[PDB]
């Protein structure tokens, strides 16, 4: 599903994500999604020239699996829905996802 999106980078370390965001210019809203190294994911986002990281964890509600960054308070069927929702709505983030880190 999410493997068809250029903002997904797979299993890369935290330091690698900061280097990539550095490679593309440290613009506000520059973001990527990566897989956790130890079924979770991490959204890495640049805001005010600082790189913050947001854990994404899965759970299941009566047969349906969802993803969340706030322990179930805001739910998404997949990472794409999480990404496009947060291109218009801040949610818990300090800024919008405005630029893809390929």
């Amino acid at each position: 599903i999410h493997r068809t999106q250029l903002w997904f980078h797979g299993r890369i370390s935290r330091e690698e994500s900061q280097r990539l965001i550095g490679q593309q210019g440290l613009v506000d809203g520059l973001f990527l999604v990566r897989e956790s190294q130890r079924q979770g994911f991490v959204l890495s986002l640049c805001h005010l020239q600082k790189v913050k990281h947001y854990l994404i964890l899965p759970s299941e509600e009566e047969g349906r699996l969802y993803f969340s960054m706030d322990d179930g308070q805001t739910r998404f069927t997949d990472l794409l829905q999480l990404v496009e929702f947060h291109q218009l709505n801040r949610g818990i983030l300090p800024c919008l996802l405005r630029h893809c880190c390929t």
């Binding site: 706030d70 322990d71 308070q73």
Partner: peptide
């Protein structure tokens, strides 16, 4: 909070 991450929620 998720310790080690920047998540901030109630």
């Amino acid at each position: 909070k998720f310790e080690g991450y920047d998540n901030e929620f109630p």
